[PDB]
């Protein structure tokens, strides 16, 4: 994508989103990031949506194949699960590489820095979902560390209803429940996040109220699943 204008890459990423061509979307946003300029709020969302959809499809396929493989226990099911797993790891490594070179170090504002650290936690979480070897504990701690830094910034710099703060807490609670085997930590985080957001809703416009309550409902859905 080196020869395409930054603005054209962004425009094409929006077109790919409309066409549900998320692999193209991700490639266009990777090219935009590699132009070296910081990303706007809208552009960060495009980056996130693109890679979340790509890796989301890979995760769904990996779980189908992993389930078939467990029920079987020739080499084909394992081989094909491994192929999908390797492609997923490649996508996660690519996103983490963009965050490390150099999105996070140039992100000074709370909204951008928390967004990218949440992203870093998420893609290490996806690596953790498939990890089974020597570095699985280190992968888990890398997710935890990124989420923790994002939480610390979000609590000092953002209101409790901020959608990025809410989505971060939601995902860190899923990390606790699903990855870290800390379901009590997951439940406490979801409840405390929901309750403090509830008490701040009175400050919001109708549109901001809608944004915040939509994510609070996801916290509620998990608490209902977990308790």
């Amino acid at each position: 994508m080196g020869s395409m204008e930054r603005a054209s890459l962004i425009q094409k990423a929006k077109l790919a989103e409309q066409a549900e061509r998320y692999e193209d979307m991700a490639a266009f946003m990777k090219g935009a990031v590699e132009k070296g300029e910081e990303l706007s709020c809208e552009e960060r969302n495009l980056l996130s949506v693109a890679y979340k959809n790509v890796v989301g499809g890979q995760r769904a396929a990996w779980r189908v194949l992993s389930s078939i493989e467990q029920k079987s226990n020739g080499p084909e099911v394992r081989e094909y699960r491994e192929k999908v797993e390797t492609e997923l790891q490649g996508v996660c490594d690519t996103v983490l590489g963009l965050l490390d070179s150099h999105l996070i170090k140039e992100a000074g504002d709370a909204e951008s820095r928390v967004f990218y650290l949440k992203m870093k936690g998420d893609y290490y979480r996806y690596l953790a979902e498939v990890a089974t070897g020597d570095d699985k504990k280190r992968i888990i701690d890398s997710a935890r560390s990124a989420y923790q830094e994002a939480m610390d910034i979000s609590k000092k710099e953002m209101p409790p209803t901020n959608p990025i703060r809410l989505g971060l807490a939601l995902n860190f609670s899923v990390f606790h429940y699903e990855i870290a085997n800390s379901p009590e930590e997951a439940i406490s985080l979801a409840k405390t996040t929901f309750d403090e957001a509830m008490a701040d809703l009175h400050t919001l416009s109708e549109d901001s109220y809608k944004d915040s309550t939509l994510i609070m409902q996801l916290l509620r859905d998990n608490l209902t699943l977990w308790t």
């Binding site: 969302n45 979340k52 939601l170 995902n171 994510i215 859905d221």
Partner: peptide, 7 residues
């Protein structure tokens, strides 16, 4: 099973 953030 649980919900993470989604757009």
């Amino acid at each position: 099973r649980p919900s993470s953030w989604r757009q």
